Every structure is written in structure tokens, then in C-alpha cells.
Amino acid sequence: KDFLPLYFGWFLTKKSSETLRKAGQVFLEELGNHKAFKKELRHFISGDEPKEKLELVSYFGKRPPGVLHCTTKFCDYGKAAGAEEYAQQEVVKRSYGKAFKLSISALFVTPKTAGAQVVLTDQELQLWPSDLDKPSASEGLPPGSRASVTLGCAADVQPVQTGLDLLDILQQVKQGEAVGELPRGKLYSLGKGRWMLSLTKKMEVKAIFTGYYG
Ligand SMILES: Nc1ncnc2c1ncn2[C@@H]1O[C@H](CO)[C@H]2OP(=O)(O)O[C@H]21
Ligand SMILES: [Cl-]
């Protein structure tokens, strides 16, 4: 009669998390100042905003307060569908507490979330859930495409939206030239307020697989 974690995932170390967090911040500051982005503001925000400049760091005001993480399976202590099934797996139990490296291939921004795209290894993909209830946007994409790290959310958006935004982006990119060059890579405008920075060099972040309890 033991209950599960709120969710399973890879939790970044202090050092790796700050490295990614900082890169995310720089991206928001650079994107917000980029002429291509400014030009499309009316596709990013939809209201009485002045033509003046939008600071994305402020826009994505809801940020993780501490270390960052890549969620694998949200369990809600066993109440989520597929939770018990996921937790019972040998590979989950065996991997519990193990160290991993996550490959970050891109940073992205939408009107709802700012995040980082994670490219899971085959070993890490074994820890990705295979549920009966799937996000419709995951269909047609490689397993684990949803893998991401939440860097920030718009005021009325929940962190879960980040992975869903990535799936939408990946559905979209499944490409035209980049519309800009930032120091860390090429900048793509995917439309509908969506932006992806494709990192010239993938970031590697160290993380531990474990379970979070609220
Ligand atoms: N229904 C869900 N499916 C997948 N991930 C979820 C779900 N609900 C919440 N999360 C994620 O679990 C964490 C606790 O809220 C948090 O980390 P995240 O991956 O940034 O989005 C959230
Ligand atoms: Cl919303």
C-alpha cells in the first residue's frame, strides 16, 4: 500500500542546472532583442500591448526555483493512468538513483513556455513511459520526443505545457533556413510565436534519475 512519487525524472546537479538555466536566460534576452522576433510580436502576444519591447525574462516569470529536471512519467502518487505500470518496471527500479547525462540539442520559446529539448539515449529511452493515453502530438514522432526541461512559463500556463509545446514544434519541423544566428547556434522561426535555437554544440548536463514527492 505504498504510494508512488508525484513524478519520476532526471534531476540536474547544482552545476549543470545553473549552466542550463543561464543559457536559457541568455537565449530569452537575445531572442527578445532580435529583429526577427520583434517583427513577429503580434503573433506572440494578442492584446493591447504597445509596439514597444517585450522582455521575455519577465514574460516567462514562472521559473523553476531550484534545480531543473527532465520528467519521464507523471504519477501523481499512483493516481495518474499508467503510473503503477511504469513504476513496477525493472528498468525503473534498477535505474532509481543512477547517474545519467542528458543531451540538450535546442532551446525553444512559445507564447506559453520556454524550454530545452532533450535527446534521450537508447538507455534513457528505456525509462520513457509507453502509456495507453498519449498526447495526440506524440503520434508519428520517435518515442521520447516529448523529453524536455522546463525553463519558464507564462503566468497562466502549467509546466506540463512545455513538453506539449515541444511535440507541437517537432510536428511542425517534420525545413526552411534559419532567420538568424545567435552565438550558440541558428535561430528558426516556426510561426505562431514559436522559436527554436538549434545549438551548434549540444549541451551535456549531468542528472540523477529518481522520484519527486511534493
Ligand atoms: N499530466 C502530466 N503529464 C506529464 N507531465 C506532467 C503532467 N502533469 C505534471 N507534469 C510535470 O510533472 C512535474 C510536476 O508538475 C512538472 O515537471 P514538468 O515536466 O516541467 O511539467 C510538470
Ligand atoms: Cl493557457
In short:
This is 2',3'-cyclic-nucleotide 3'-phosphodiesterase. The chain is an alpha+beta fold. It has helices spanning 14-33, 35-39, 41-44, 56-59, 83-87, 90-95, 122-125, 161-173, and strands at residues 7-12, 69-74, 99-109, 113-118, 148-153, 180-182, 185-191, 194-212.
**Class of secondary structure makeup:** alpha+beta
- Radius of gyration, CA atoms, in whole angstroms: 17 Å
> Which topology does CATH recognise?
2',3'-cyclic nucleotide 3'-phosphodiesterase fold
Oligomeric state of the chains in view = monomer
Say which CATH homologous superfamily is assigned: 2',3'-cyclic nucleotide 3'-phosphodiesterase superfamily
Number of domains: 1
Cα shape: globular
Question: What are the distinct ligands in this entry?
Answer: 2',3'- cyclic AMP, chloride ion
Q: For the report, how would you describe the main beta sheet?
A: 8 strands, antiparallel
Report the strand count. 8
- Termini separation (Å)? 18 Å
Question: Which percent bin holds the helix content?
Answer: 25-40%
Counted by DSSP, the helix tally is 8
Instruction: Report the CATH architecture.
Output: Alpha-Beta Complex
Strand content: 25-35%
User: Could you state the order of secondary-structure elements as H and E?
Assistant: EHHHHEHHEEHEHEEE
CATH class: Alpha Beta
PDB class: hydrolase
Keywords: hydrolase, myelin, nervous system
Assembly: monomeric
Entry title: Catalytic domain of mouse 2',3'-cyclic nucleotide 3'- phosphodiesterase, with mutation H309S, crystallized with 2',3'- cyclic AMP
